[PDB]
Amino acid sequence: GLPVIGRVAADAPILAEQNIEESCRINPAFFNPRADYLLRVRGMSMKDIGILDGDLLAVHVTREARNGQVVVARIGEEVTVKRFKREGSKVWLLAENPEFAPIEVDLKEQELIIEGLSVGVIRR
Amino acid sequence: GLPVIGRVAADAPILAEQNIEESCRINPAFFNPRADYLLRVRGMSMKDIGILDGDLLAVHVTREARNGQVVVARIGEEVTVKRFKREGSKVWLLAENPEFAPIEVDLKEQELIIEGLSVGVIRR
Ligand SMILES: [Ca+2]
Numbered sequence: 223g224l225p226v227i228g229r230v231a232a233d234a235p236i237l238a239e240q241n242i243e244e245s246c247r248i249n250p251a252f253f254n255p256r257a258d259y260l261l262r263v264r265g266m267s268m269k270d271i272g273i274l275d276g277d278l279l280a281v282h283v284t285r286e287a288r289n290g291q292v293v294v295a296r297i298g299e300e301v302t303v304k305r306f307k308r309e310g311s312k313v314w315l316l317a318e319n320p321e322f323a324p325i326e327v328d329l330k331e332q333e334l335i336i337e338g339l340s341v342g343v344i345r346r
Numbered sequence: 347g348l349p350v351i352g353r354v355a356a357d358a359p360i361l362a363e364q365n366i367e368e369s370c371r372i373n374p375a376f377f378n379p380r381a382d383y384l385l386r387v388r389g390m391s392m393k394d395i396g397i398l399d400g401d402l403l404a405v406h407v408t409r410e411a412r413n414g415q416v417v418v419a420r421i422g423e424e425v426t427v428k429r430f431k432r433e434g435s436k437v438w439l440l441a442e443n444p445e446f447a448p449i450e451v452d453l454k455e456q457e458l459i460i461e462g463l464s465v466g467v468i469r470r
């Protein structure tokens with residue numbers, strides 16, 4: 223199965239037991255690459271690629287992201303779902319909804335952790 | 347489980363073994379109402395409500411449809427996913443994409459079977 227993560231505690235691994243709201247019986251290998259957890263998406267910042275408020279993002283754990291990838295990012299202690307774009311020592315977390323400005327991260331002043339790579343979505 | 351269904355054979359039920367590619371281990375009651383199958387969507391006709399080419403539509407089997415519901419419909423032996431609209435003896439199956447014109451059905455002339463209601467999506 224796959225854990226469903228609703229809240230993300232500060233300064234703790236995302237896959238910590240205390241973050242798990244419930245469980246889904248779907249096999250991890252349903253997705254490719256294999257999913258490690260499902261994360262509830264909040265808001266409509268990614269609606270133009272069909273990821274809507276309340277969807278569950280299937281997430282493959284990785285700490286490195288490549289330009290163009292849809293990633294889960296922790297900026298400070300806030301978790302967001304955004305498209306990744308790195309400009310040298312700058313990172314852009316791009317929304318897929320013209321109503322939301324790109325979030326700029328200066329890797330020198332702000333902590334950024336990539337929590338993983340989107341490998342799918344479950345909508346219910 | 348939930349059977350995953352690709353192409354659909356003529357004059358056989360959608361849940362016929364010959365249509366099933368594999369089973370997903372997700373619980374049918376993960377969805378509400380409960381799903382009966384997952385159907386592979388083709389093309390971008392429903393993109394405006396976040397249903398994209400290749401998505402698996404979670405479907406609750408029912409044979410009746412109400413105006414504005416996103417349904418699986420079979421006209422002759424072509425299966426489509428569209429928004430239902432009926433006035434008297436005529437039905438329009440509406441796209442959620444401005445580039446796609448309505449499919450019109452004359453219920454006096456053509457058989458229309460509702461195969462079910464959309465209750466969710468799995469994208470992988
Ligand atoms: Ca920290």
Ligand SMILES: [Ca+2]
Binds near residue numbers: 386400402470
């Ligand atoms: Ca598939």
